[PDB]
Amino acid sequence: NPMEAMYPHIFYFHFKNLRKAYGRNESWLCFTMEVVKHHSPVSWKRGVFRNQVDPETHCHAERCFLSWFCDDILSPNTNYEVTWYTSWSPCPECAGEVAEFLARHSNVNLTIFTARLYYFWDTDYQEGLRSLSQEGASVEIMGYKDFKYCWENFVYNDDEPFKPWKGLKYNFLFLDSKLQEILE
Numbered sequence: 001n002p003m004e005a006m007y008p009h010i011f012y013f014h015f016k017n018l019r020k021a022y023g024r025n026e027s028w029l030c031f032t033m034e035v036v037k038h039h040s041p042v043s044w045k046r047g048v049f050r051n052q053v054d055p056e057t058h059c060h061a062e063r064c065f066l067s068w069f070c071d072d073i074l075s076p077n078t079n080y081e082v083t084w085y086t087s088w089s090p091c092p093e094c095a096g097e098v099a100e101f102l103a104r105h106s107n108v109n110l111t112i113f114t115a116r117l118y119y120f121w122d123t124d125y126q127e128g129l130r131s132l133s134q135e136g137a138s139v140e141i142m143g144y145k146d147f148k149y150c151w152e153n154f155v156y157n158d159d160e161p162f163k164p165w166k167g168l169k170y171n172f173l174f175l176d177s178k179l180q181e182i183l184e
């Protein structure tokens with residue numbers, strides 16, 4: 001953690017965008033990061049975080065990203081454009097922290113593409129997402145193009161083509177409309 005890639009079956013299993021997702025008990029989070037140091041060309045980082053429950057380093061993937069980012073990456077004077085591609089939308093605790101962080105470090109911008117909405121009808125969860133939309137962060141649902149990109153960048157794909165599951169696009173529309181509605 002951060003790993004450079006997922007296995008194929010972990011990707012197809014954990015990023016499938018069904019409404020009833022049994023039992024994806026982990027969250028996975030791919031990221032790209034455009035590091036804009038100030039008198040230098042742009043550089044890029046790329047990775048994958050899984051949530052942790054070992055000994056005493058419990059973190060949802062979001063916290064691990066943030067702990068890794070602060071401890072090892074955040075630097076004087078440089079700007080950052082982060083993108084996440086996340087299996088599940090964030091719990092409201094995680095969304096809480098992230099929104100703090102953004103408001104506090106305004107040199108960082110954050111886009112979050114999410115494959116699935118955890119409990120989209122519940123307001124504690126809708127709250128998290130509204131909070132993040134407020135502190136700057138874009139929140140989108142992953143569509144076909146985003147799945148293809150993560151396949152091509154975060155998986156040991158053996159150079160094979162992405163193989164979309166049936167229903168991928170339908171699931172995207174259903175979840176998009178739910179997002180639009182939640183973010184009034």
Ligand SMILES: [Zn+2]
Nearest residue numbers: 060090091094
């Ligand atoms: Zn969380």
